[PDB]
Structures are given as structure tokens and as C-alpha cells.
Amino acid sequence: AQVLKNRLLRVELDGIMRDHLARAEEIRQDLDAVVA
């Protein structure tokens, strides 16, 4: 019946979990470029 629905939930879940790494990667690349 609704594996379409659970598939949509896991899709939006991996979207919001990619959101944390897309947040963290730029902040980790900002904090090491102040060494000049």
C-alpha cells in the first residue's frame, strides 16, 4: 500500500540529514583559513 509514503519520508529524512553536513562543511572550511 504505502511504501511510496515511507519512501518519501526516508527521502526527506536524508535531505534534512544532508542539511547538517552541508551546514558543517562550510563552517569547517572557514575556521582553518584564518592562519595567514
Partner 1 sequence: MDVHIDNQVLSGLGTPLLVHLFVPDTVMAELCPNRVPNAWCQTLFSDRTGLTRVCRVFAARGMLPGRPSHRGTFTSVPVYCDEGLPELYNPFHVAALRFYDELVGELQIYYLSLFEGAKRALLSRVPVSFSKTRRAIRESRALVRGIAHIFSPHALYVVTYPELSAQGRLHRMTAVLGAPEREFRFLISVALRISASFREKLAMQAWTAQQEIPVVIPTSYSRIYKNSDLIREAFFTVQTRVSWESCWVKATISNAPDACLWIDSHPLYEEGASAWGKVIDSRPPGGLVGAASQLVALGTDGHCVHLATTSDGQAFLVLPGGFVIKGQLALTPEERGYILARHGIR
Partner 2 sequence: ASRVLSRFVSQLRRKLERSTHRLIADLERLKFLYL
Partner whose binding site includes residue 33, from partner 1, partner 2, none (CB under 5 to 8 Å by kind): partner 2
Q: Is 23 in the site for partner 1 (CB under 8 A)?
A: no
Partner whose binding site includes residue 2, from partner 2, partner 1, none (CB under 5 to 8 Å by kind): none
What residues between 1 and 36 interact with partner 2 by CB under 8 A? 5-21, 23-36
Alpha helices per DSSP H over 1-36: 3-30
C-alpha separations of 15 from 1, 2, 4, 29 in Å: 24, 20, 16, 21
Q: Please report, as ranges, the residues that interact with partner 2 according to CB under 8 A.
A: 5-21, 23-36
